[PDB]
Design an enzyme around this catalytic site. Structure first.
Site, PDB file in Angstrom:
ATOM      1  N   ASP A 156       0.795  -1.251   0.039  1.00  0.00           N
ATOM      2  CA  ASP A 156       0.122  -0.022  -0.150  1.00  0.00           C
ATOM      3  C   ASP A 156       1.046   1.222  -0.184  1.00  0.00           C
ATOM      4  OD1 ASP A 156      -2.511   1.700   0.558  1.00  0.00           O
ATOM      5  OD2 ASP A 156      -2.202   1.280   2.449  1.00  0.00           O
TER       6      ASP A 156
ATOM      7  N   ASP B 184      -1.895   5.557  -5.072  1.00  0.00           N
ATOM      8  CA  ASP B 184      -2.203   4.429  -4.181  1.00  0.00           C
ATOM      9  C   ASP B 184      -2.247   2.953  -4.688  1.00  0.00           C
ATOM     10  OD1 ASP B 184      -2.418   3.361  -1.731  1.00  0.00           O
ATOM     11  OD2 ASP B 184      -4.448   4.162  -1.399  1.00  0.00           O
TER      12      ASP B 184
HETATM   13  C1  LIG Z   1     -14.336  -3.506  -3.135  1.00  0.00           C
HETATM   14  C2  LIG Z   1     -14.036  -2.254  -3.532  1.00  0.00           C
HETATM   15  C3  LIG Z   1     -15.095  -1.065  -3.786  1.00  0.00           C
HETATM   16  C4  LIG Z   1     -13.222  -2.305  -4.683  1.00  0.00           C
HETATM   17  S1  LIG Z   1     -12.895  -1.541  -2.362  1.00  0.00           S
HETATM   18  O1  LIG Z   1     -12.687  -0.244  -2.432  1.00  0.00           O
HETATM   19  O2  LIG Z   1     -14.006  -1.940  -1.192  1.00  0.00           O
HETATM   20  C5  LIG Z   1     -11.599  -2.340  -1.937  1.00  0.00           C
HETATM   21  C6  LIG Z   1     -10.728  -1.750  -1.045  1.00  0.00           C
HETATM   22  C7  LIG Z   1      -9.456  -2.765  -1.093  1.00  0.00           C
HETATM   23  C8  LIG Z   1      -9.679  -4.127  -0.394  1.00  0.00           C
HETATM   24  C9  LIG Z   1     -10.069  -5.134  -1.426  1.00  0.00           C
HETATM   25  C10 LIG Z   1     -10.411  -6.514  -0.858  1.00  0.00           C
HETATM   26  C11 LIG Z   1     -10.394  -6.787   0.303  1.00  0.00           C
HETATM   27  C12 LIG Z   1     -10.035  -5.763   1.284  1.00  0.00           C
HETATM   28  C13 LIG Z   1      -9.671  -4.537   0.791  1.00  0.00           C
HETATM   29  C14 LIG Z   1     -10.043  -0.559  -1.578  1.00  0.00           C
HETATM   30  O3  LIG Z   1      -9.957  -0.311  -2.546  1.00  0.00           O
HETATM   31  N1  LIG Z   1      -9.744   0.140  -0.305  1.00  0.00           N
HETATM   32  C15 LIG Z   1      -9.224   1.445  -0.489  1.00  0.00           C
HETATM   33  C16 LIG Z   1     -10.216   2.483  -0.638  1.00  0.00           C
HETATM   34  C17 LIG Z   1      -9.684   3.777  -1.070  1.00  0.00           C
HETATM   35  C18 LIG Z   1     -10.015   4.159  -2.265  1.00  0.00           C
HETATM   36  N2  LIG Z   1      -9.532   5.437  -2.531  1.00  0.00           N
HETATM   37  C19 LIG Z   1      -8.639   5.571  -1.440  1.00  0.00           C
HETATM   38  N3  LIG Z   1      -8.847   4.608  -0.526  1.00  0.00           N
HETATM   39  C20 LIG Z   1      -8.353   1.803   0.623  1.00  0.00           C
HETATM   40  O4  LIG Z   1      -8.898   1.958   1.735  1.00  0.00           O
HETATM   41  N4  LIG Z   1      -7.095   1.407   0.649  1.00  0.00           N
HETATM   42  C21 LIG Z   1      -6.327   1.740   1.923  1.00  0.00           C
HETATM   43  C22 LIG Z   1      -5.280   0.362   1.679  1.00  0.00           C
HETATM   44  C23 LIG Z   1      -5.823  -0.780   1.897  1.00  0.00           C
HETATM   45  C24 LIG Z   1      -5.104  -2.195   2.116  1.00  0.00           C
HETATM   46  C25 LIG Z   1      -5.712  -3.331   1.856  1.00  0.00           C
HETATM   47  C26 LIG Z   1      -6.630  -3.552   2.985  1.00  0.00           C
HETATM   48  C27 LIG Z   1      -7.701  -2.464   3.303  1.00  0.00           C
HETATM   49  C28 LIG Z   1      -6.858  -0.867   3.297  1.00  0.00           C
HETATM   50  C29 LIG Z   1      -5.564   2.837   2.104  1.00  0.00           C
HETATM   51  O5  LIG Z   1      -4.587   2.848   0.840  1.00  0.00           O
HETATM   52  C30 LIG Z   1      -6.349   4.184   1.912  1.00  0.00           C
HETATM   53  O6  LIG Z   1      -7.248   3.855   2.799  1.00  0.00           O
HETATM   54  C31 LIG Z   1      -5.586   5.529   2.559  1.00  0.00           C
HETATM   55  C32 LIG Z   1      -4.738   6.028   1.240  1.00  0.00           C
HETATM   56  C33 LIG Z   1      -6.057   6.570   1.441  1.00  0.00           C
END
Ligand SMILES: CC(C)(C)S(=O)(=O)C[C@@H](Cc1ccccc1)C(=O)N[C@@H](Cc1cnc[nH]1)C(=O)N[C@@H](CC1CCCCC1)[C@@H](O)[C@@H](O)C1CC1
EC number: 3.4.23.15
Length: 334
Positions: A35, A219
């Site tokens: 990440d 990201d």
């Molecule tokens: C199903 C979806 C709609 C594709 S999702 O967005 O829920 C997917 C999740 C990642 C995921 C997928 C499968 C299982 C578990 C987790 C995702 O993309 N999460 C992002 C959301 C986001 C989008 N734009 C900014 N954030 C996410 O939360 N990623 C975090 C990383 C992520 C690592 C893997 C598990 C959950 C956190 C982190 O990078 C961000 O919070 C912070 C920079 C803002």
């Protein structure tokens, strides 16, 4: 050192891109997402109650099996845009590629089913700065730079389209077999965060959005492109896309007619076509097809920002350069 390790990755359904690390002596192996949007590492711990469904499906780190284990015990909570986690700190030997490092990392003990029961990966490794790290713990890449083995203070991402390599992170350089042309570079707004200035977002030839400029988080740990809610309302109203609950959808026959979305970063336009952001799960007007874009309100100081996740990085092979605090994009070879 002129060393350059590489981690092979698995693409699962184009939303999860995870690879393998090993922790402890002898090594206990875990799959994790790398990440760039966060700075901590954690995996589930042997101490995670079996009442957590997520904890029964994923693999557990066992300190008692580990002769490299040094005890810390400090509690933490890690809050992501989607999902949070609390456990406690442990020191152990960890390895990623050839490289081996003594790392502080979180042993997780509450792990919510949503979103984690869906995670093919067990863990995550934060590829961001110490400024975003809970507990101010030294992140793993800073820790590898302190070794002085990398031939360059960079790591590069390749993210393939479904399925045959699923993706690859190189530590210490890029892999040319996986991009063409040369890298174009944008400097970081400020050190601390993998984030650049974006000039404009077009939907087809005309600039719909980000006219007076905005922020962009690169990201690797986001499955999609995100914007604020008001940027995405309007972007979807451009694409005639219709809000479902969480997702946006189009009827499948119109999927391929959708216009190009382009992103103006630095001195160049990064263009996505329908083939890049519509999940074409059918072509029938009966069916509805999801878009690899959504609304994600990131709070200050980082937010409001867009995030350029996998949707983009699949298209454009990405390099994160620490020595010069910049990011490079190049076209990916598939
Ligand atoms: C199903 C979806 C709609 C594709 S999702 O967005 O829920 C997917 C999740 C990642 C995921 C997928 C499968 C299982 C578990 C987790 C995702 O993309 N999460 C992002 C959301 C986001 C989008 N734009 C900014 N954030 C996410 O939360 N990623 C975090 C990383 C992520 C690592 C893997 C598990 C959950 C956190 C982190 O990078 C961000 O919070 C912070 C920079 C803002």
């Amino acid at each position: 050192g002129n060393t350059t390790s590489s981690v092979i990755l698995t693409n699962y359904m184009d939303t999860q891109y995870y690879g393998e690390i090993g922790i402890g002596t002898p090594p206990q192996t875990f799959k994790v997402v790398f990440d760039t949007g966060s700075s901590n590492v954690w995996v589930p711990s042997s101490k995670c109650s079996r009442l957590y469904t997520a904890c029964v499906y994923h693999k557990l780190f066992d300190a008692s099996d580990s002769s490299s284990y040094k005890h810390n015990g400090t509690e933490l909570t890690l809050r992501y845009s989607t999902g949070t986690v609390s456990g406690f700190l442990s020191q152990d030997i960890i390895t990623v590629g050839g490289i081996t490092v003594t790392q502080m990392f979180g042993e997780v003990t509450e792990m919510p089913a949503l979103p984690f029961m869906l995670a093919e990966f067990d863990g995550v490794v934060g590829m961001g700065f110490i400024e975003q790290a809970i507990g101010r713990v030294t992140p793993i890449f800073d820790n590898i730079i302190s070794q002085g083995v990398l031939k360059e203070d960079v790591f590069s991402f390749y993210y393939n389209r479904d399925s045959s390599l699923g993706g690859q992170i190189v530590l210490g350089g890029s892999d040319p077999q996986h991009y063409e042309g040369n890298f174009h570079y944008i400097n970081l707004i400020k050190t601390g965060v993998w984030q650049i200035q974006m000039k404009g977002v077009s939907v087809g030839s005309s600039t719909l959005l980000c006219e007076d400029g905005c922020l962009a988080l690169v990201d690797t740990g986001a499955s999609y492109i995100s914007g604020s809610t008001s940027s995405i309302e309007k972007l979807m109203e451009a694409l005639g896309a219709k809000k479902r609950l969480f997702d946006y959808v189009v009827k499948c026959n119109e999927g391929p007619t959708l216009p190009d979305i382009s992103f103006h970063l630095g001195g160049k336009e990064y263009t996505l076509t329908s083939a890049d952001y519509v999940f074409q799960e059918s072509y029938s007007s009966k069916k509805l097809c999801t878009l690899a874009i959504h609304a994600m309100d990131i709070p200050p100081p980082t937010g409001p920002t867009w995030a350029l996740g996998a949707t983009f990085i699949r298209k454009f092979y990405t390099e994160f350069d620490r020595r010069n605090n910049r990011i490079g994009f190049a076209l990916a070879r598939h």
